[PDB]
């Protein structure tokens, strides 16, 4: 079968300074507020504004404070595997 609303997106940051997304926290509680020009995410094209960020390289964002999720994502930015939920 095919995963419909949970999708895996691989990004290679060797070519990009930044992800080019604004991440907001409101669990599914972290999501994409905007996608910016010139970043790894826009280049890939699969992630959309409003998608929820579930996982980055087997780190799950649930039970994570806001500072903690930034520090984690910061350190990670090898290939980056993002798991996002469309709904």
Domain definitions of the chain by residue range:
6-85
Task: Give the up-direction half-sphere exposure of residue 5: CA atoms within 13 A in the CB hemisphere.
Answer: 6
Whether the CB-CB separation of 63 and 82 falls below 8 Å is answered with no
Residue 74 CA to residue 66 CA, distance in Å, equals: 12
Residue 4 CA to residue 12 CA, distance in Å, equals: 23
Domain 6-85, what fold?
Pdz3 Domain (2.30.42)
Method: X-ray
Helix (H) or strand (E) holding 11: strand 6-11
Torsion angle of C-alpha atoms 59, 16, 35, 22, degrees rounded to 10 = 50
| Residue 43, both tokens | 């280049």
CA neighbor of 60 nearest in space, from 87, 21, 32, 30: 30
Distance in angstroms between the alpha carbons of the first and the last residue of the chain: 18
CA neighbor of 53 nearest in space, from 33, 79, 38, 76: 33
Whether the CB-CB separation of 66 and 46 falls below 8 Å is answered with no
């Amino acid at each position: 079968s095919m995963s419909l609303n949970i999708i895996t997106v691989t990004l290679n940051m060797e070519k990009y300074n930044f992800l080019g997304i604004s991440i907001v926290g409101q669990d599914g509680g972290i999501y994409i507020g905007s996608i910016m020009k010139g970043g790894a995410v826009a280049a890939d094209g699969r992630i959309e504004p409003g998608d929820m960020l579930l996982q980055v390289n087997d780190m799950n964002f649930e039970n994570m404070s806001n500072d903690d999720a930034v520090r984690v994502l910061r350190d990670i930015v090898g290939p980056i595997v993002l798991t996002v939920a469309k709904c």
